[PDB]
């Protein structure tokens with residue numbers, strides 16, 4: 634799995650022509666590791682081999698990854714702010730998306746992304762069945778706006794890998 638993804642991180646990078654793209658896996662204990670990482674003009678250091686703490690993300694945000702399955706961050710310059718809400722469990726049967734064309738994130742990510750010197754941040758969740766196995770993310774300088782039409786093409790690209798990582802769990 635970790636090896637296979639190594640070729641995926643670079644493969645997708647070619648398509649998304651993103652300078653930096655890495656895959657993030659998750660553990661039940663609340664621990665995640667980077668099993669892949671690519672760099673373009675080497676504007677950022679290699680994070681590969683670094684374990685990220687779950688605390689980095691609560692849950693309400695991850696929920697969107699389950700229902701929204703889109704994950705898109707606008708220019709951190711727009712300074713969008715999104716925090717928690719008072720008693721807002723939101724009861725629904727099953728309505729995919731049904732939210733703004735963008736996903737504002739608390740100032741937590743603002744500095745986080747900016748700290749990486751990345752104005753843009755394209756993310757894509759990798760879920761198999763009803764569970765989440767991995768997470769795809771991309772970061773780079775102003776890569777011009779993104780089209781929804783082209784986004785879909787990649788949206789499926791994230792689904793394909795979902796099969797590779799899933800089929801890998803069996804063998805691995």
Ligand SMILES: *[C@@H](C)[C@H]1/C(=C/c2[nH]c(/C=C3N=C(/C=C4\NC(=O)C(CC)=C4C)C(C)=C\3CCC(=O)O)c(CCC(=O)O)c2C)NC(=O)[C@@H]1C
Nearest residue numbers: 657685689690693694706716717736738739741742756770
């Ligand atoms: C802020 C000081 C602290 C913090 C809190 C925090 N994070 C989020 C949301 C996200 N954080 C990430 C982080 C990553 N990007 C990556 O590339 C990686 C490695 C693969 C990570 C871990 C992401 C993707 C999100 C989701 C936002 C999006 O739309 O993409 C939140 C929001 C939760 C909410 O809804 O309240 C918060 C509060 N993260 C830190 O690192 C600090 C400790």
